[PDB]
Each structure stands twice: as structure tokens, then as C-alpha cells.
From a paper:
[name] ([name]) is an ancient exoribonuclease conserved in the course of evolution and is found in species as diverse as bacteria and humans. Although [name] can catalyze the polymerization of nucleotides, its main cellular function is the 3ʹ-to-5ʹ degradation of RNA (Grunberg-Manago et al., 1955). While the catalytic core performs the phosphorolytic action, the KH and S1 domains participate in RNA substrate capture and autoregulation (Wong et al., 2013) and are powerful facilitators of [name] activity. Cryoelectron microscopy (cryo-EM) was used to solve structures for E. coli [name] in the apo- and substrate-bound forms and in a ternary complex with sRNA substrate and [name] (i.e., the RNA carrier complex).
The best class was refined to an overall resolution of 3.8 Å, ranging from 3.2 Å in the [name] core to 4.4–7.2 Å in the [name] binding region. In our model of the RNA carrier complex, [name] cooperates with the KH and S1 structural modules of [name] to capture the RNA and prevent the 3ʹ end from entering the central channel, thereby safeguarding it from degradation. Indeed, the 3ʹ end of the 3ʹETSleuZ RNA, marked by a poly-U sequence, is bound to the [name] proximal face. A short, exposed hairpin threads into the KH-S1 portal, where it is mainly bound by basic loops extending from two [name] S1 domains (identified as S1-3/S1-loop3 and S1-2/S1-loop2). Only three complete ARN triplets could be modeled into the density, yielding an interacting sequence pattern 5ʹ RN ARN ARN ARN RNN NR 3ʹ.
Numbering used by the authors:
A (entry chain N): 1 to 689
B (entry chain O): 1 to 695
Write the structure that this text describes.
């Protein structure tokens, strides 16, 4: 028989179970993690040998939300689970971000971790469960890994931190901050936040890091009980028996070259010293093969810039450590789009557009927790010419979707709630050119494009991409980092939010010994640079324009009395069908208390108002008035006062006298006095000659 | 700061704007182009050095219609733009065809030009805006390129030409010709026409070329103001001693080999002397192989055939200049299909099929220009076995769409109007074998398959793929060119139309000096070959068949009153769903009471008529049942005229107050028949003792 090893927790008043040892025995390791009636099966396979022509490390992650886990049949025509959506692909990225730095330097063997959701109760989100499982599975396997990461989701409600909140706490919460870290340090931070201050969110991360300690302790128990024999993988030695000679021949001139002011002359001189030292040392294989020699020269370049940045003022572009690049910000740039903007920051440029739509058009996405409507849609397009090089159109990847979601979190915090503004809005960003941190340039552009469209957005929103360099006790916090300056980042972090408070924070710490002391001054420097940007944006547009641009659809609403419903509906929706086809306009959106008119243009809304007021309780008459002869017989006449239908006036009303014959009223089209003058009564007219 | 550079020529009665230097500054060039307000952002990136040992030119073009440009959010479930589409990959082909020949010979650096539509006004089509933008972007970049190209769309209304017509001007027009050219020559022409004559179509191309020199002038002043420096490209020399030496060792016998009458012996002898010279001739610029020597032999082969064709009548097929391949035609080839044909023309063959459908099966086409729902659908399938090769069936090439649209333009003109013929018709063509033009063979087959399915088309249509070879004052028009006469096609052109006139025209010119005198004699030779083909097509079948084939859906209508309409529906069309599935018959509700009915045969439709009348008729009439029924009670009785269900009746209206007792019979199971009396309180049911439709 087979037997399973089982451990239990109490993690934020939930009972986590790490079952292992009875499933997928051919895989390098496997665990089923369940937290509360919610379970993910996660399994690692890592081959022992990689083809010696492999330079990069192929860690790969897949996360799959099998719909049977929610106990219901798929909605797709093929009745089968489809491609990864936003939802699967973003969760695959959050699991990958903490695991990739923990693997040892120069580890290159191919590793694949596959996480399947197999149960859910709607109250508990599976992503945090999958993160615990991935660190358990990797640390149970023999594979070289620097200790198991925990994970915590932290909510903020009634000025109190709440560990691993349910959907019921999160709908009320002002914060959704996720932490992942080892025993020693935070490794990843991610959040949406309702304009909290810096010291509130740096409280949230350290609370989240303290609470996840139980998970890291329990995984260390399970690894003692059921852990495989460890791998003996060792790296190739650092020197490769040429390090010192090439360092001596390159470094003197190469370290000089970065003093040169002109980007072109600097690049040229660096290429000259590189090509000369490549041409000089052609004595052997792996010099006649440039690759190993060139990889060493590229490493010298990184070392010389890194040392300059710590002590000396000049950067890769000669700016001061904190000197943000120049801005200019055009608005209303595109002729027929609802609102549009062209935000720039050095050589990163983000053309952004906002587009407005009716209650019909909104996205109804289906996910394991629930099928649900939302009304703010953000799409991020990154075409290849943006980086000055050619390839396949679109070029879609996890990073481009990551950047889309991060930007949406930044400005979703500051969107109006539906009662102030009833439209669905799509914001769509074309990255016309990029050389670093294009995601934070896209949130600045979205803030412009919404104000320019005349959405009642609460406040202007901006973002900055920072970094930090550290050596022992020495560190420098730098602002507006380039793509070329990525090597200097021991802590890549992005902050976006209004003057009042921050909308989003994201951090990829790559190294041990970052502290609550350091993160305080780093956020305090980001506050400065972010308030500088808003100083320019407030001059380019000052407040959202009162009136929505002329090409947008219009939605508006009027209050109605409880008796008017039968008049608005008619018989089997006949008056609705007539009104909608007269007006080319949908009106069904409300029918109790109010009616809502959702029109393709302003004239069609006015046309709808005219027609509904000519029908809805317009038939009733209380005083003496005129309305024409419309259709006639001997027995009486049909007489029109308005748009709403009017029945036969009997000839005994029409004629006072005995005769009652059609000769008295034979003339068609005649204008005549007509007052119903009748309450608590069926439809009648007291016209009398 | 950034500073955009603008210019604003007047062209087509609209205001145009060439705005540059503000966006995508990392890209080799970029332009925002805007006419009226239908703006496209178009940018080119071309790498400075070509990857080693390349042979073909990897120019790539793609064009993307972002939906936000029309001011609406996407209707897709993902609420975002996905893959390219029929209406965009075709437009990319229209941008590519005039650009591709205009690059210098031996240029093989990778170039990518990408056009995004960013605003649209529904009256002005963005495609012509993209063509002037692509010309501007390439000529502003340092890329070696033989000057700018303009593009013009020409309409015909009241016997007068109109430049750049609106959608309003176009819907009334008998023509939709697009022409693109430099100041020298009309590099591309592409056109649907409502049976215009030769003089009218060749007038349209010269008009459209005269009044677009303004675009090429304004691009030239912008290139002086804002153009980057022309970067240096030099052609790889190909003029070694071994070129002349291999020619000397090949041309004489290659001339001797091309004299051979038999196709098979010709191919055999050419392959032999190729194989011999590949095996023998040393001093190749690499260890001895095909990799230049075969490409040099291929140049001799091209020169020999081309010179023979200019000097004298003989070709590779053994036919003369004005000659057409052998034809065979047969019709009704596929059973259980509404109509089918097998048009054949030497080694080119198309199994064309027509199928009819309802107004409901019509495909809605969504564009930036608004919805463009249509009723004649053309699909073009080119499987790999058609050319005697293998692999990757069913994944379409850009030219499977390209050829499909050209064929649709050819047969769109002769389709009947909706009131004379109400069915939506899909024409599908399988190219069963091809070594010649497959698109013009598909038009010939489509006109057969529509007549065979009995669609009341105006006239039979055919098409021809001409070619022209030119050498100084020498030129020859070839009336029907194969798949390996490609090197002889300096002017590649395809024309399809009725006896009366042209329905579609397409020309790719890739030589200078094409005068109107040349284009007249070329079209006049196409007229000859096209009338020959109709001579065979008319002899296989004369006119559309008396009515549609017995399997085809026959649609008809009966008028019934609105109280029966609600009774045919029930709730949520549930009675329609039941009756339509029971009868296998389609129906449509209309508010005037004329319900439409469609089935594959008469009897199924008649069954549906009978059932909806019988079910929605009042209960007063019906079958003459013996009303023996149980469940009789003193305080009202349940009585069924028919069926298991038992309806109610009461002490008074059982027997029109003739008695005080509930039933005069006063007996359960008694035989007296029952039918409804009209009176019906909503909370009451009436089923009186009534025989023989007493009512």
C-alpha cells in the first residue's frame, strides 16, 4: 500500500495541510496544499543535465485553473478549458518573481513547476495557497534552492491589519498588499491601495513578513520528514584561467571611457576598447570563439558603472543620482478619440487614449470565485519599433500583461464610483518609444487621457520607477532608472499615486539585508520625485473638463411615478418596442423609480425624451384644452390631445341634443375643445356641442 | 521639448497633414498622416546590416485597425483586439504590392513597416491614407528607395470621374479603381467595376495618375525639411570571369534544349546539362556546389526563354503569343450540393460549389467604417497536393485571402439584387490542381456553379491572366501565362468580365515606359481571349436552371393575425423551438403577420403550416370526438374534449341554464360531446356539452 505524510498549521485562523508522497511519484517532487475547502496540486520536474550550449536559466511556471474545481461545467462552445487569460498569466508571474532570485548563481538546468487548482470555496483565493505549495515542492525536491519562501496577503480594515482576508473583508478593505520572503528578508511586495500614506504600507509589509514565519517553520519540519537526497550541482570556477589578463588590458581605458559626455563618442570608444581587446587575445578556442571573452568584458562594464554610481555623481547618461529626466505633456493629440495624451519622460513615450461605452458594453469575466461585471478596462500594447528593432507584431509576453495590470491598479484607486459617472471606460496605451520603466509613464498618460476626456476622476495620478545599489554598509537610492541601469538594481521598485497617498507599490528585492530603516528613506525620496512630476501635469491640464467630448454616447435618467410603469411598458412591452425603434435608443436600463436613456448621440436622447413625455401620462387631461378630430364613426369620434392613445368619445357626449347623427361631426381634422376631467375613472372625454 | 514638423497640401477636396519628428524617435522613421480626420500612425524600422548569406528580400508589412479609433470598446468576450482579419491582411497586401518592386536589386536587409489606424470619420477610408504614409515614412528614412509613390481612389458617377470619393459618393458609383504610381509609371492598379468598357477603365487609371502628382511633390519638400541622411548600400558584385565562363559552357546547349518539342524531354535535357555543369565546372567561390553555379545557370535559362519569346512566336507550352490552353467543362459534378462545376484549363482546375441559405445565415462584417453586413460569401481553398507538394494543410497564406477577394470582385457585378433573389449564397472553390493563375479559373467556375444552382445572374463571366515582355521598342502580349513564365511577366495583369464589359481589373507593373498605346493593345488582346472562353462556357450551359435543386431550402410565407403570432411563440419562442425541431423546418416572425417558412422539401414546410394553424386556431372547431369523460362532480365537472388533461365546466354553462343540475345527463363516462363556449373569467374555464362545431 501507499501512505501519505501530512502536516497541519493554523495560519490566520485557517487550517493549512501539506499532504505529500502518494501522488505523481515520477515527478521530482509533488504536494497537495489545501487551506480551507480550497486545494492546489503543485509539482516540480527538473532534469539533471542541460545541453552545454545553454547560457540563460530556463525556470518555467504554469498555473492552471481547472473549472471542475468550482463544481460547474465550462461555458465555452468546445466545453473545454482554454488558453491562459489575464487571470492565470498574472498569477504565474507572482509565483515566479520570488523563486527566480533564490536559485544559485550560474544554475542552468531546466526546471518546470506546474500548479493545478483542484478545489475552491469562493471565500479563499487560491493564488496564496499555490505560492506556499511552490516553495514546499521546490524545498522537498533535492534541487538547489536557498530556503522556502512563505506568502502573506494583508488587508486593512478599521485601521487594523488582517492576515489572509476573505472576499468579505477585501470588499471593505483599503489595501490588498501581498508579501513573499525568506526567514531573513522580504523578496517580493505587490499591492493595490486606496491612497494610504508611506508609513501605513511599510507597516503592512513588516506585519506580513512577521506573520508568514509559521509557514516557513512548518515547511522545514516537512522537509526533515519527507525530503529527498539533495543534488550536488556545483558551478564552473569563476576565473576560467584568463580573468586577470583581460581585466588589466580592458579596465584602465574602459573606466576612462565612461567620463566622456557625448553618448555617441562614449559608445564608440567603449566599442573600440572592446573590439581591440577581443582582436588582441585571439590565442585559443574560447577566444577565437569570442563568447566567453566578450561575456567577461561585459561584466567589467557592469563593475565600472556600479562603482562610479556609488561614489561619483555621473550616471550612464550623466544625470545626478536623483535628477529626473525632462518632461513635455501634449493632450487632445488624436482628432476623433474621446480623450488622448502623449506623456514623455526622456526617450520613454506613452500615447494613451480613453474611450466611453454604455452599460451593455462592459466586460462580464468568468473566474473560479464568481462570474462578475467590471467597467474600467486597461490594455497595454508594446510594439517592437518602440525599442528601435524589428520582429513579430504584438509580441505578447507575461511582462506586457504584468505592466497592464500594474498600471490599472495605479489609476483604479482614483476612478469615480458608478453613481457619479455611469459609463464603462477603456484606457488603451500605445508605447510609441521605450528605454525604461514604460509602465509608470503609462499611468501618468492614463491620468491625462481621463481628465482630457472629461471623466470626473478624483485626482491627478503619477508614478516613478526607482532603484537602490548596496555594498556592505554603503547604499545609494536613485530615481528614474533606465533599461541599461537595470544591473545596478538590488531593489527594483515602482510607486504610483496622488499627492494625497499611494495607489500602488511593487518591489523585487534581489539581495539580503534590506531593512525597515532603508525602505523609509527610499519611499521618502520617491515622494519628492513623484510630486515634481505632478507639478508639470497640473500645468498641462488643471482639472477634468466638465463636458464629455461630442462623439461619446450619452447616458442620463429621469424620476417616474409608480402608476406610469404600465404606460412605459404598454402591452407585452409594445410601447418599449415602439420607443426603442422610434429613437434607435435602448431605454430598458431602469423602469422602477427612474428610467435610464442610453443614446449613441445627444440628439437621439432629446428625441427619446420628447417621445416618452408625449406618451407617459400625457394622455390624462385635467383642464379645458384643444385636440383634433382624428378618426370618426356615427357612434362617436377618436380625438387626439397628445402621443398617448385616446379612445372613442360617444355621440351622446359630442352632441347635447336628441338627434345624435354623424352629420353633426362629419368634418375630419377639425380642432376642438377636449377635457377628460375624470379621476378614479376609465378613459373618457366630456367634449360637448 | 519635442517639435513636430507639419505640411498641408490640398488633395481630393480634403485637408491633409504630414506631421513628423514627435513620435517613435528610436524607429528609423515615423509619420502621423491625417486627411479630414482619419489618421494613421505609420513607422518603418530597417536594420543597418543584413544577416549573413541571405538570398530573398524580407520586406514585411502589417496594418492594424485599433477599434478605439472609431470611438467604441471592442465587442469580443476578451474586450480587446486579437489576430489580424480579412479586412486588414488584404489592406497590408495593397500597401506591399506597389512598395516591393521599387527597392533596388540585391537589397536584402530586413525592413518592417507597420501602420496603426488611430482616428476614423466613417466617410473617408483609411487605406489610401496608409499608402501615402508608407511612401512618406520610407522616403524620410535613410533606406535606399526609388522616390515616393502617391495613391488615388477613383469613382465614376453620371459619366464623370471623382477623386477620393466619400462612402456617399461611392455607393452610387459604377467603379472603385485604386491606382498607385511614381511620376514615371502606374506601378499598381486594382479595381471592381459594374461592367464598364475598355475605354472607361483605361481612362480611370490615367485620370487617377494625373491628379495625384501633388502628393509626390509634397512628400519631396518634407524629405528636404526633415529627412535623415541616405545611409550607404552597395550591390554585391556578380560579374566574375566565372559568370561569362559558365554562360559559354551553358547557353548554346540550353538554346538546343529549349528547341525540343516535348515538355518532358525538354525538362530532362535541361536537367542533364545542368547536372553535368554542376558536376564538372570547378573554380566556384566555395567548395564545388549549387550555391552560386545553379543560380548562374538559372539566369542563363531565363535569358534564353525571354529572348526566344521576344524574337519569335514559340513559348514553353508550344503555343503562340495569342493562344489559350485547352478547355474542358462539366457541371453538376458533386451530388447533394445545391450547384457544382469542374472548370479545367490545361493543368489548372477548380471544383467550385454554390450553397444557398436564409437572410439569418448572412455574415455581419464589422469595420472601423461601420457594420457592412453582406449576402454573397466567397471562400478560396488552396490545398498543397494542388501543386504536387506536401505539408501544413488548412493554415491559410495571405494570398488565399488575396485571390479570394479578386474572384469575388469579378462575380459580384453579375449577382442579382436582393428583391429578385432572396437567398444568401456561399461560393467555395477547391483548387484541385494548379500551375497557372488559379484566381481567374475560380471566376469561370463560380459563374458555372451559380447558373447550375439556378441563381438568376445577369450573364456568364470568365477571366484571363495576361502578361507582357518588353525590350526597347520590342514588346509582346502573352494571352495566358503559366506558373514558370513568371520571369517574362514585366506587366502582370488579370481581367474578368461579361461580353458587355470588365467586372474586375488588376495590374502589377515592374518596368518603366508603359504608354497608353501599349495598355490599349494589351486590353484589346485580353478581350479576344476572354470571348473565346465564353464560347465554351455558353456551350456547356446557356442560362440558369428553371428553379433551385430539390435539396435547396424553399422559402414561402402565409399571413396570420397577431393573436395567432403570440400563440405560435408561446413564451421565449418555446412553441417555435418545439414546432421547428418537430418539423425540421425554419420559420421567421414578422409584425405584419407574414410569417416566413423554409424547408429542404415542400412536405416538411406544409406540415409546419398545418401544425401552426391547428395549434393556434381557437377551440371552437376541431375533431368530432365522442365526449365520454370521468371526474364529473355536482359543484362543477372536469370534461376533456380530447387528451389526458381534464378541463373544467360549471353548473350553469355546461348546458346553457336548461337545468339546475350541473349536467343534464348527470352521468360520469356519458357519451355527450364537449367544446368551449367563449365566456372566460381569468379564474374560470368553460367546456359546454356541444357537438358538430355548434360554437
Amino acid at each position: 500500500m501507499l501512505n501519505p505524510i501530512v502536516r497541519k498549521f493554523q495560519y490566520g485562523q485557517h487550517t493549512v495541510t501539506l499532504e505529500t508522497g502518494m501522488m505523481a511519484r515520477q515527478a521530482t517532487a509533488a504536494v497537495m496544499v489545501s487551506m480551507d475547502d480550497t486545494a492546489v496540486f503543485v509539482t516540480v520536474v527538473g532534469q539533471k543535465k542541460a545541453k552545454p550550449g545553454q547560457d540563460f536559466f530556463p525556470l518555467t511556471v504554469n498555473y492552471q485553473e481547472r473549472t471542475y474545481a468550482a463544481g460547474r461545467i465550462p461555458g465555452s462552445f468546445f466545453r473545454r478549458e482554454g488558453r491562459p487569460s489575464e487571470g492565470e498569466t498574472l498569477i504565474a508571474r507572482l509565483i515566479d518573481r520570488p523563486i527566480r532570485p533564490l536559485f544559485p548563481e550560474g544554475f542552468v538546468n531546466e526546471v518546470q513547476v506546474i500548479a493545478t487548482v483542484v478545489s475552491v470555496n469562493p471565500q479563499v483565493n487560491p493564488d496564496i495557497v499555490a505560492m506556499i505549495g511552490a516553495s514546499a515542492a521546490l524545498s522537498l525536491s533535492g534541487i538547489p534552492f536557498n530556503g522556502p519562501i512563505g506568502a502573506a496577503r494583508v488587508g486593512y480594515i478599521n485601521d487594523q491589519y488582517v492576515l489572509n482576508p476573505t472576499q468579505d473583508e477585501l470588499k471593505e478593505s483599503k489595501l490588498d498588499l501581498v508579501v513573499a520572503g525568506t526567514e531573513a528578508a522580504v523578496l517580493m511586495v505587490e499591492s493595490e491601495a486606496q491612497l494610504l500614506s508611506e508609513d501605513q504600507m511599510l507597516g503592512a509589509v513588516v506585519f506580513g513578513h512577521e506573520q508568514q514565519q509559521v509557514v516557513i517553520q512548518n515547511i522545514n519540519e516537512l522537509v526533515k520528514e519527507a525530503g529527498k537526497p539533495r543534488w550536488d550541482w556545483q558551478p564552473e570556477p569563476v576565473n576560467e584561467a584568463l580573468n586577470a589578463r583581460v581585466a588589466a588590458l580592458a579596465e584602465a581605458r574602459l573606466s576612462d571611457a565612461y567620463r566622456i559626455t557625448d553618448k555617441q563618442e562614449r559608445y564608440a570608444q567603449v566599442d573600440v576598447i572592446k573590439s581591440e581587446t577581443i582582436a588582441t587575445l585571439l590565442a585559443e578556442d574560447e577566444t577565437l570563439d569570442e563568447n566567453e571573452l566578450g561575456e567577461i568584458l561585459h561584466a567589467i562594464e557592469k563593475n565600472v558603472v556600479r562603482s562610479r554610481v556609488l561614489a561619483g555623481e555621473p550616471r550612464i547618461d550623466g544625470r545626478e543620482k536623483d535628477m529626473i529626466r525632462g518632461l513635455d505633456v501634449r493632450t487632445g493629440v488624436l482628432p476623433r478619440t474621446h480623450g488622448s495624451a502623449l506623456f514623455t519622460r526622456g526617450e520613454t513615450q506613452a500615447l494613451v487614449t480613453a474611450t466611453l461605452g454604455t452599460a451593455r458594453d462592459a466586460q462580464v469575466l468568468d473566474e473560479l470565485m464568481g462570474e462578475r461585471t467590471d467597467t474600467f478596462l486597461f490594455h497595454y500594447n508594446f510594439p517592437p519599433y518602440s525599442v528601435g528593432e524589428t520582429g513579430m507584431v504584438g509580441s505578447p509576453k507575461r511582462r506586457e500583461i504584468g505592466h497592464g495590470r500594474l498600471a490599472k491598479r495605479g489609476v483604479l484607486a482614483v476612478m469615480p464610483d458608478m453613481d457619479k459617472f455611469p459609463y464603462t471606460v477603456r484606457v488603451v496605451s500605445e508605447i510609441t518609444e521605450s528605454n525604461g520603466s514604460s509602465s509608470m509613464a503609462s499611468v501618468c498618460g492614463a491620468s491625462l487621457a481621463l481628465m482630457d476626456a472629461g471623466v470626473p476622476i478624483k485626482a491627478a495620478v503619477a508614478g516613478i520607477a526607482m532603484g537602490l545599489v548596496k555594498e556592505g554598509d554603503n547604499y545609494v537610492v536613485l530615481s528614474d532608472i533606465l533599461g541599461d541601469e537595470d544591473h545596478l538594481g538590488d531593489m527594483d521598485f515602482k510607486v504610483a499615486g496622488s499627492r494625497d497617498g499611494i495607489s500602488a507599490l511593487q518591489m523585487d528585492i534581489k539581495i539580503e539585508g534590506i531593512t525597515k530603516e532603508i525602505m523609509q528613506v527610499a519611499l521618502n525620496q520617491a515622494k519628492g520625485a513623484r510630486l515634481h512630476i505632478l507639478g508639470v501635469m497640473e500645468q498641462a491640464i488643471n482639472a477634468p473638463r466638465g463636458d464629455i467630448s461630442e462623439f461619446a454616447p450619452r447616458i442620463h435618467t429621469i424620476k417616474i411615478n409608480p402608476d406610469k410603469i404600465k404606460d412605459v411598458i404598454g402591452k407585452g412591452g409594445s410601447v418599449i418596442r415602439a420607443l426603442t425603434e422610434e429613437t434607435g435608443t435602448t431605454i430598458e436600463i431602469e423602469d422602477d423609480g427612474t428610467v435610464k436613456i442610453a443614446a449613441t448621440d445627444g440628439e437621439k436622447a432629446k428625441h427619446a425624451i420628447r417621445r416618452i413625455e408625449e406618451i407617459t401620462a400625457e394622455i390624462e387631461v385635467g383642464r379645458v384644452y384643444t385636440g383634433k378630430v382624428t378618426r370618426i364613426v356615427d357612434f362617436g369620434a377618436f380625438v387626439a390631445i397628445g402621443g398617448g392613445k385616446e379612445g372613442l368619445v360617444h355621440i351622446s357626449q359630442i352632441a347635447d341634443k336628441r338627434v345624435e347623427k354623424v352629420t353633426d361631426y362629419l368634418q375630419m381634422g377639425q380642432e376642438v375643445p377636449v377635457k377628460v376631467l375624470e379621476v378614479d375613472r376609465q378613459g373618457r372625454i366630456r367634449l360637448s356641442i
